[PDB]
Amino acid sequence: VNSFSGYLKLTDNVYIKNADIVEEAKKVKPTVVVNAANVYLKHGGGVAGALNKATNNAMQVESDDYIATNGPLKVGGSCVLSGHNLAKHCLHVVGPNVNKGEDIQLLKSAYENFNQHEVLLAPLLSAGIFGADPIHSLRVCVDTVRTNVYLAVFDKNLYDKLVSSFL
Numbered sequence: 683v684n685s686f687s688g689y690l691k692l693t694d695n696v697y698i699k700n701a702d703i704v705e706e707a708k709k710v711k712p713t714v715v716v717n718a719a720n721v722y723l724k725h726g727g728g729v730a731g732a733l734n735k736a737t738n739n740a741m742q743v744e745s746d747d748y749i750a751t752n753g754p755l756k757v758g759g760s761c762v763l764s765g766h767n768l769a770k771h772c773l774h775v776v777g778p779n780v781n782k783g784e785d786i787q788l789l790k791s792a793y794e795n796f797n798q799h800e801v802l803l804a805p806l807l808s809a810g811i812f813g814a815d816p817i818h819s820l821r822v823c824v825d826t827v828r829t830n831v832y833l834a835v836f837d838k839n840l841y842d843k844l845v846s847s848f849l
């Protein structure tokens with residue numbers, strides 16, 4: 683049994699809710715919240731911008747030190763950093779950004795990072811300002827992630843379309 687409330691069950695392991703990942707993280711304090719990161723961990727907008735704002739910029743400070751030591755992530759890659767006031771850990775995952783011309787096949791690689799964590803609160807990778815089709819992102823999630831994932835979807839309109847169209 684876990685703390686997550688109000689989710690619709692899509693599959694054995696994938697659950698979805700119309701929610702603000704920030705407000706959901708603040709309520710649940712999950713072991714892992716996933717950030718929709720870029721390779722530079724520059725958390726300027728969308729999921730990354732909102733999560734970072736909720737940490738009072740502590741996520742960005744920590745991220746800048748990570749990049750100065752390790753250099754950029756790979757598209758499709760991830761790193762584990764602090765969850766600050768939102769979660770125990772933040773899994774920063776880089777989905778491909780279609781608005782930069784990145785290969786959408788890297789979306790599966792991105793979701794494979796979730797399998798290293800038994801339970802996660804996450805957004806749909808490569809959705810929103812990353813430019814991918816969220817319907818496609820949800821399909822790749824369901825077909826890739828085997829651990830228990832609780833998806834928070836920002837738009838009520840998009841949420842209803844994801845549920846109605848789910849196979």
Ligand SMILES: Cc1ncc(C)c(N)n1
Pocket residue numbers: 701702703704728729732804805806810834835836
């Ligand atoms: C799931 C989600 N996507 C985007 C934003 C900004 C947010 N707060 N939550």
